[PDB]
């Protein structure tokens, strides 16, 4: 049920 | 059908339109995306310069690994700047949510993905975090089996904390107790699915309201001896209910946000009848906040990468259209799903909003729009 | 470790009857970081004691924090058995406070107005006559003023005794702030610093106004420097004079209330340095006796050659500077007049009773607050 | 954080 926070966030 | 980055087209158009849409757009790329955003109560205006100082409580959301609780200070131009970090604090996993305590804004409680609810005092940690990556929280709050998002400090009972969770439960803590481990005073087992948000009522120490994936609004009273059944029950939406927010001026009025793309207005005095449904979002809604300045102003955000601002007093007004009459403004500044936003408590109409592409925007719509 | 420290308390306690004319002890629900007597004494005609009040604060693990005013029954002129019919200490009022009270100081011109240092960098201003004695159970803090200028918490605080409404604050952010809250109605408003002196480069530990020259004040910082400031000066980034006061952090100072050129400073090098404003390239003296850090130093408000100091060595030393150079048989320098060993924890603050000579309040980290007074033959 | 203020005060 983790469709509120993405998998693999990306870095800047 | 993939490859659809139609997103980029509309960001190009939006940017070109800001001179006549905002009195203020600031953009900043965060080192990792923040899942959470909340202004701190304190505004500073140095007696010399032409800007004022505000501060945010943010978090990180990394991809293996090392997350931090973040305090950032924001310089906002005066009538007649740039955003930097004040302090990082090592955090066990992503910060699902960060919320300061009104009675002591030094105190911040965070939701991790790891079951734990943690309590930080940022004045008791270095501006430069220990590179070991170690997390040393001042309290460890236990009750949940799963991560959650919903979190809320009690404005009328210092130290009392509510948390919402995937384990279907809501937990109560009053941290005025005894490694550094405190157990739930109470666990409200009303909901039958994931609990998405929880919030205290703003005048009544005893009441709070929760939302869950079972499409329900439940109103709770803490005197109640039953932790298995709330004072009231509503079928709030035709899908998941993800957030709620009591009206900071009207004690019977609250709003709910849903996976059904609608914002439901509620009257505590009679929950059998929905007051209103704000329809305009094109996808899920995950956050809703009342403006702390104007009693009839409400904002919402979510997956459709937009932030809608509503004025509920123009409900029912006649028009020729391209959306409801109560629809005051659409902020199209983000090129991703918005995770959280926060009204500036001191600078009216200024809003902070943070998205899944690490963009943090401090912004304000133009004044002719709300006159 | 509380091993040897306890041996000495067992000994100290048994010795108090003719080392002191008064020992009162009271354990606070939470430890106080701050202590200052209010100037005003109340003395009912019937009874044989008089009532003084302190300004104390809390420093909790979590919970709620409060600004505190306490009442003390101090004898007038009976005999009895003094500290051991035993005179009482109570809490008169709590006011909800945003985080621990780093320091509380009342205004000399209006002793109802009290300023506190919070850990959220905020300086708050209260009129305790405008709050109930029983704090609001919501726990929300409602200050009459909110003073802004700082980025980090601090301790140093000092009201200007000859310029009403002028407050200076010291801080970890390396800055000193001045507020003039004079034309400012005390009903909640936010006020920003008039001026910020950026001389120091490290944590500023304390600041105090001169007691007779309205324009002058001095600050000390962890950069081991004592700086004397002038408000007339248009330059706030460099003070009129600067001294390398100690070989470690400088944690406090206190100007002499009878002698306009003399101040003293206290540090982490276990010493108190006596200073002459007329010539700062020369430390007048170094009072050496403490065995650990010094965090507070105060002149006696009664006698111009009496000085006290306190800090981590869980002791409060009282100095007499006229006995500099006197001969001895020693158990310490001649200028060392009394060693108060009443605390078994690091002492946070003390303050001389302004109306009762030689009466001192002193508070430590284990929530113990002591009202005490050395025997008269020691200073006669 | 200072070396003046304790880390963990205790309740009485």
Curated annotation (Swiss-Prot), chain B:
Keywords: Acetylation, Cell cycle, Chaperone, Chromatin regulator, Chromosome, DNA damage, DNA repair, DNA replication, Isopeptide bond, Nucleus, Phosphoprotein, Repeat, Repressor, Telomere, Transcription, Transcription regulation, Ubl conjugation, WD repeat. It is found in: Nucleus; Chromosome, Telomere. Changing residue 94 to A: Loss of interaction with ZNF827 and loss of localization to telomeres. Gene3D superfamilies: YVTN repeat-like/Quinoprotein amine dehydrogenase (2.130.10.10). Residues 1-100 are annotated as: Interaction with ARMC12. Transmembrane segments: none annotated. There is a cross-link at residue 128 (Glycyl lysine isopeptide (Lys-Gly) (interchain with G-Cter in SUMO2)). Changing residue 356 to A: Decreased interaction with ZNF827. Changing residue 96 to A: Loss of interaction with ZNF827 and loss of localization to telomeres. The modification Phosphoserine is found at residue 320. GO terms for biological process: brain development; chromatin remodeling; DNA repair; DNA replication; DNA replication-dependent chromatin assembly; negative regulation of cell migration; negative regulation of cell population proliferation; negative regulation of DNA-templated transcription. Expressed in neuroblastoma cells. This is Histone-binding protein RBBP4. GO terms for molecular function: histone binding; histone deacetylase binding; RNA polymerase II cis-regulatory region sequence-specific DNA binding. It comes from Homo sapiens.
């Amino acid at each position: 049920m983790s469709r509120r926070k993405q998998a693999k966030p990306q870095h800047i | 059908a993939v490859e659809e980055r139609v997103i980029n087209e509309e960001y190009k158009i939006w940017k070109k339109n800001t001179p006549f849409l905002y009195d203020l757009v600031m953009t900043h790329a965060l080192e990792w995306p923040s899942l959470t955003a909340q202004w701190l109560p304190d505004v500073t205006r140095p007696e010399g310069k032409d800007f004022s100082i505000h501060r945010l409580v943010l978090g990180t959301h990394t991809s293996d690994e090392q997350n931090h609780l973040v305090i950032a200070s924001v310089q906002l131009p005066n009538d007649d700047g740039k955003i930097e970090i004040e302090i990082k604090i090592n955090h066990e996993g992503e910060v699902n949510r960060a919320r300061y305590m009104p009675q002591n804004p030094c105190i911040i409680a965070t939701k991790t993905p790891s079951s734990d609810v943690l309590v930080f005092d940022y004045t008791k940690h270095p501006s430069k975090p220990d590179p070991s990556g170690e997390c040393n929280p001042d309290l460890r709050l236990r009750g949940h089996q799963k991560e959650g998002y919903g979190l809320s400090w009690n404005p009328n009972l210092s130290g009392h904390l509510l948390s919402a969770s995937d384990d279907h439960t809501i937990c109560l803590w009053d941290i005025s107790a005894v490694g550094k481990v405190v157990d739930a005073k109470t666990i409200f087992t009303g909901h039958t699915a994931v609990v998405e948000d929880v919030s205290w009522h703003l005048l009544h120490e005893s009441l709070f309201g929760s939302v869950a994936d079972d499409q329900k609004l439940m109103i709770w009273d803490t005197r109640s001896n039953n932790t298995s059944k709330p004072s009231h029950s509503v079928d709030a939406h035709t899908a998941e209910v993800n957030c709620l927010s009591f009206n900071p001026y009207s004690e019977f009025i609250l709003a709910t946000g849903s996976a059904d793309k609608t914002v439901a207005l509620w009257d505590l005095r009679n929950l059998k009848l929905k007051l209103h449904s704000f329809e305009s979002h094109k996808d899920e809604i995950f956050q809703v906040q009342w403006s702390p300045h104007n009693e009839t102003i409400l904002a919402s955000s979510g997956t459709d990468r937009r932030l809608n601002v509503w004025d509920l007093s123009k409900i029912g007004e006649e028009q020729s259209e391209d959306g409801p009459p109560e629809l005051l403004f659409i902020h199209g500044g983000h090129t991703a799903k918005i995770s959280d936003f926060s009204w500036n408590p001191n600078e009216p109409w200024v809003i902070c909003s943070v998205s899944e592409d690490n963009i943090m925007q401090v912004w304000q719509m133009a004044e002719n729009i709300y006159n």
